[PDB]
Design an enzyme around this catalytic site. Structure first.
Site: not given
Lengths: 107, 96, 385, 481
Positions: A26, A36-37, A56, A82, A99
């Site tokens: 991902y 961010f990731d 999540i 979140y 994502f």
């Protein structure tokens, strides 16, 4: 909910089933478009187990609706990942996450 | 004390050390997981890749510094060597 | 003057105050580094003794009172209206000198820094004002470096005000240094301050400069230059195809870039316009270029999804047919013979157009330009050349 | 052709020709001219393939040139191109190439590649510029595409004054031409904008009232064109970060635009979007009444709705028919384009009309719910300029092109990956290579201190903060650094 757009088609048959680990790569994107990731940065596939609240929910139902070998775009509303607090330091409050997820292998 | 019959010191560091050492803990920094147990321990890093890269880069530095070129990495010999030797020292202390 | 007695009756020793503040700053000036060690130590001892005597006699609160009474006037013009013209010109200088004297009085003295803790809260209350921001920040830094109790009394409100100083007054490395001093003092880390600074500054990604690795992207074009103008002999319809022999989806951690379409030059120059010569920019990032990636229409660095039969990113053994119509500005694509459901319309036609493909590493594609330069896989649309 | 070569100081300006000012010392063989603060006759002319060898001795401040080995001379017998100068901040190789001119610089990294060094330069003991180096010299060239940068205080043509807003007056920024009226002043359209942009909503919706003021997303700024300035030459509106068009003659018809028409399967255009980088109107045409500007300066107000994306313009209390609709997540910079016909050109005003938020609320996050207009020091007027350098990448992508056959067409193939760290300025909506911080000093200092802050927040085993920082600074970035 979560909207899924197909980037590359999969087999279309081997959907993840109940209590099966999913191996995915991902890449986390904020709505404005800042990363961010990303598991590809770490070069380690991400493994998580369906239905045991390990990640999540937006990611969970995204992968559940996705199929084996299918690269798809997962967009998560603030309420599905979140909600209001957000991740401290990473995700701002009330944020929408995009994502890019690939289902490499069901094992 | 001595590796073999003749009383020659072995290379420092290499050998069999049985003394108890702190155990090496790492956690994968993934932000899709909701578990908070990852906060304990330091984020994982490719230690073998970093080790090989540091060795190669020190080897190239020993090449370049001896020639006394006008263009060290970072513009100064300090900028070339201090960060690299600091990273090497940190790796050696950690014992990789 | 605050009680509204007329200016001439009130005596305001403006010049003498400024001269004494300059002399006092010189008196508390720190030792020079070029000095020999013994002399440096002697001057340091003398400075410490002077600071201790001043703090014990209470010379510091008087400076704070003067600063507070000078801060009631918003601007030098307002102070000039209240008192007089010379006071108006001297208001900024005296206010800066007072802050410099306070910083010199508190610098390097741990006892003075510890006793300034009570007044620290009042100090940060005027940080937003432009006439004293630098002096207040310097005094804050001097206190924070030497006083552990300062970190204990600094709260979330003060940390947030310090951060908002970046947002309002722009980038400044001194406030960053103050934020660094907040985290660790004398080898002791304040975890609460670390957490607050992180959670209040990092997630925004709007103040600090951001970093990311971007794949290099290069563009490949033919020699042909295509344009339309009144009374000129050029055919307004054109057609060409691109074949993807191989493409690796992820050569690196970043996705492979592959876009095809048309680009337009700026004016009649042969050089492509509106885009950076080198970098991570490709077809469709500027308003002089128009691109297709297999899923989105790219123009002006903004992409929108377009429907297609079996939508997919550009894969191996894919034939892309690009159509350019200059009679009415219209760029349309057709993938594998299936018509893409979007087109570019009403773009600028002043410049010259040419085929272009942008890519990162890990591709293998072929231009099919027709004739002896590669026969088309599909028949061109009627009227196209 | 019109080509020059020589040594320049680190203060040389890309826009100015070499030798016109004191920054550079050059040799123009096209006219047999040596250039430093003027031109005087020196040497002969070159032909195609001729080689110039630049020769500098900083010890006693002497410099000469050679052409195909022979030493060029001035009118006298002196070999010295420039008799004497000062060390200053140093000297670097430089060249200027004219229209349709091609040249090559050889820094002498390999002595064998220097053809005339042996006959002239080696016996004297001169050293190749890059003789004792291991890496290629990073060459910097003049930037072709103009960028917006802060108006300098020393600028000879443009002056900006910050006017604080009183109780009855809004904060204002005044643009004034100091050199206007005087001889040598350049009359051309100048492009001005504000530093910080307004961000539209990510997803579009489908006695002032305080509740309405708090719930609204509309922002307003106004521009007052002073009497005596030509209103037709002044343009007011919004621009995006993509605007990089420097034309001596600017017209609203010649703005870059495109219309993406997404259609259904059978062909119906279900949606049409107009995308452009400039959304601006003309004060001259907005002045429908006429002479409503000489008694009092013309008032054009710009209203932006960040929730709907509707750009409407209010002029002299009457709403202009011109309006622009933008797409979600668009950064709009307030901007004014004007050609000065008076010492006073125009004036940014940051006030608010009834039921509208001031521009500061939209710009700054901390002032989101503050109806009082503000002008923080971050906001400042910038102008489009060409005085900027660009850095050539040391390596380029390896692309091979070949015609396989009459059937297979042309093959282009790139198989070797390349990467670079990109520094993204948030307020500017711009990205540059991080290696440009070798010459961008203030950004270098700020980013070094930002890195120190990154270390400090995670110092002494703050593992949660380290995990948070792994998002901002990744493993690939650390390895590349």
């Amino acid at each position: 909910g979560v909207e899924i757009e197909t980037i590359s088609p999969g087999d279309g048959r081997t959907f993840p089933k109940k209590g099966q680990t999913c191996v995915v790569h991902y890449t986390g994107m904020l709505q404005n478009g800042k990363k961010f990731d990303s598991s590809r940065d770490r070069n380690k596939p991400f493994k998580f187990r369906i239905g045991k609240q390990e990640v999540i929910k937006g990611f969970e139902e995204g992968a559940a609706q996705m199929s084996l070998g299918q690269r798809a775009k997962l967009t998560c509303t603030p309420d599905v990942a979140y909600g209001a607090t957000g991740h401290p330091g990473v995700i701002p409050p009330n944020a929408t996450l995009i994502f890019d997820v690939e289902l490499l292998n069901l094992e | 004390l001595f590796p073999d019959e003749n009383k020659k010191h072995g290379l420092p560091g290499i050998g069999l050390s049985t003394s108890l050492r702190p155990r090496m803990q790492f956690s994968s920094p993934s932000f899709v997981s909701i578990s908070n147990e990852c906060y304990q321990y330091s984020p994982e890093f490719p230690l073998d890749i970093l080790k090989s890269k540091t060795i190669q880069m020190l080897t190239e530095a020993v090449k370049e510094g001896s020639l006394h070129a006008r263009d060290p990495v970072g513009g100064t010999t300090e900028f070339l060597f201090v960060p690299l030797i600091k990273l090497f020292y940190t790796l050696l202390i950690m014992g990789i | 003057l605050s009680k509204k007695a007329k200016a001439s009756t009130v005596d305001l020793p403006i010049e003498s105050v400024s001269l004494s503040l300059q002399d006092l700053i010189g008196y508390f000036h720190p030792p020079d580094e070029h000095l020999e060690h013994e002399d440096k130590q002697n001057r340091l001892r003398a400075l410490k003794n002077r600071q201790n005597l001043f703090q014990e006699e209470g010379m510091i609160n008087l400076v704070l009172e003067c600063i507070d009474r000078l801060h009631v006037y918003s601007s030098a013009a307002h102070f000039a209206d209240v008192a007089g013209r010379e006071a108006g010109e001297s208001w900024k200088s005296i206010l800066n000198s007072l802050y410099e004297l306070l910083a010199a009085l508190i610098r390097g003295n741990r006892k003075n820094c510890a006793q300034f803790s009570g007044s620290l809260d009042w100090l940060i209350s005027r940080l937003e004002r432009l006439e004293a921001s630098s002096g207040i920040l310097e005094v804050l830094h001097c206190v924070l470096v030497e006083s552990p109790e300062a970190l204990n009394i600094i709260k979330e409100g003060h940390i947030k005000s310090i951060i908002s100083l970046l947002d309002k007054h722009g980038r400044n490395h001194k406030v960053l240094d103050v934020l660094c001093s907040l985290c660790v003092c004398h080898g002791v880390a304040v975890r609460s301050n670390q957490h607050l600074i992180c959670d209040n500054l990092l997630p925004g990604r709007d103040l600090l400069l951001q970093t990311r690795l971007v794949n290099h992207v290069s563009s490949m074009r033919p020699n042909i230059f295509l344009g339309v103008s009144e009374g000129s002999a050029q055919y307004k319809k054109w057609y060409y195809e691109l074949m993807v022999d191989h493409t690796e989806p992820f050569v690196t951690a970043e996705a492979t870039h592959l876009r095809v379409g048309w680009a337009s030059t700026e004016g009649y120059s042969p050089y492509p316009g509106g885009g950076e010569e080198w970098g991570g920019n490709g077809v469709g990032d500027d308003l002089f270029s128009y691109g297709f990636d297999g899923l989105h229409l790219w123009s002006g660095c903004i992409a929108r999804t377009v429907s297609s039969p079996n939508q997919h990113l550009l894969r191996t053994d894919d034939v892309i047919s690009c159509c350019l119509d200059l009679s009415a500005p219209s760029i349309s694509f057709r993938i594998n013979g299936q018509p893409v459901q979007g087109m570019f319309e009403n773009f600028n036609i002043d410049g010259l157009f040419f085929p272009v493909v942008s890519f990162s590493a890990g591709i293998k594609v072929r231009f099919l330009l027709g004739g002896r330069h590669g026969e088309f896989k599909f028949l061109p649309p009627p009227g196209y050349a | 052709g019109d080509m020059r070569v020589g040594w320049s100081r680190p203060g040389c300006q890309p826009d100015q020709e070499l030798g016109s000012d004191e920054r550079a010392f050059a040799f123009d063989g096209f006219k047999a001219q040596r250039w430093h603060q003027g031109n005087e006759h020196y040497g002969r002319s070159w032909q195609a393939g001729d080689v110039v060898g630049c020769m500098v001795d900083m010890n006693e401040h002497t410099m000469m040139f050679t052409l195909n080995g022979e030493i060029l001379l001035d009118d006298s017998g002196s070999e010295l191109a420039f008799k004497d100068f000062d060390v200053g901040d140093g000297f670097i190789p430089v060249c200027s190439l004219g229209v349709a001119q091609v040249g090559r610089m050889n820094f002498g990294k390999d002595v064998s590649t220097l053809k005339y060094f042996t006959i002239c330069g080696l016996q004297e003991g001169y050293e190749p510029f890059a003789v004792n180096t291991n890496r290629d010299i990073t060459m910097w060239l003049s930037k072709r595409l103009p960028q917006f940068l802060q108006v300098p205080s020393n600028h000879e043509h443009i002056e900006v004054t910050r006017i604080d807003g009183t109780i009855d007056s809004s904060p204002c920024l005044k643009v004034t031409q100091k050199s206007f009226g005087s001889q040598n002043s350049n009359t051309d359209i100048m492009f001005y904008r504000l530093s910080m942009p307004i961000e539209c909503a990510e997803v579009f919706s489908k006695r002032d009232d305080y509740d309405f003021l708090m719930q609204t997303s509309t922002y307003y700024y106004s521009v007052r064109i002073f009497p005596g300035q030509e209103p037709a030459n002044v343009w007011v509106g919004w621009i995006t970060s993509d605007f990089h068009q420097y034309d001596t003659g600017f017209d609203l018809d010649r703005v870059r635009t495109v219309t993406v028409t997404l259609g259904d399967e059978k062909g119906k255009v279900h949606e049409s979007i107009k995308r452009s980088n400039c959304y601006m109107v003309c004060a001259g045409e907005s002045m429908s009444p006429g002479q409503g500007r000489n008694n009092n300066g013309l008032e054009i107000g710009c209203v932006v709705d960040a929730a709907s994306g509707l750009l409407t313009f209010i002029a002299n209390g009457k709403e202009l028919s011109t309006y622009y609709q933008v797409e979600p997540s668009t950064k709009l910079f307030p901007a004014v384009f004007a050609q000065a016909t008076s010492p006073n050109v125009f004036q940014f005003e940051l006030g608010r009309i009834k039921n509208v938020m001031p521009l500061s609320a939209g710009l700054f996050k901390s002032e989101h719910k503050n109806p009082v207009p503000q002008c923080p020091p971050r906001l400042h007027v910038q102008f489009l300029s060409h005085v900027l350098w660009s850095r050539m990448p040391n390596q380029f992508l390896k692309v091979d092109v070949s015609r396989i056959s009459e059937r297979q067409g042309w093959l282009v193939q790139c198989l070797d990956p390349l990467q670079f760290m990109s520094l993204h300025i948030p307020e500017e909506n711009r990205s540059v290579d991080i290696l440009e911080l070798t010459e961008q000093e203030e950004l270098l200092k700020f980013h070094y201190h930002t890195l120190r802050l990154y270390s400090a927040v995670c110092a002494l085993g703050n593992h949660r903060v380290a995990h948070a920082l792994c998002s901002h600074v990744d493993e690939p970035q650390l390895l590349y650094a």
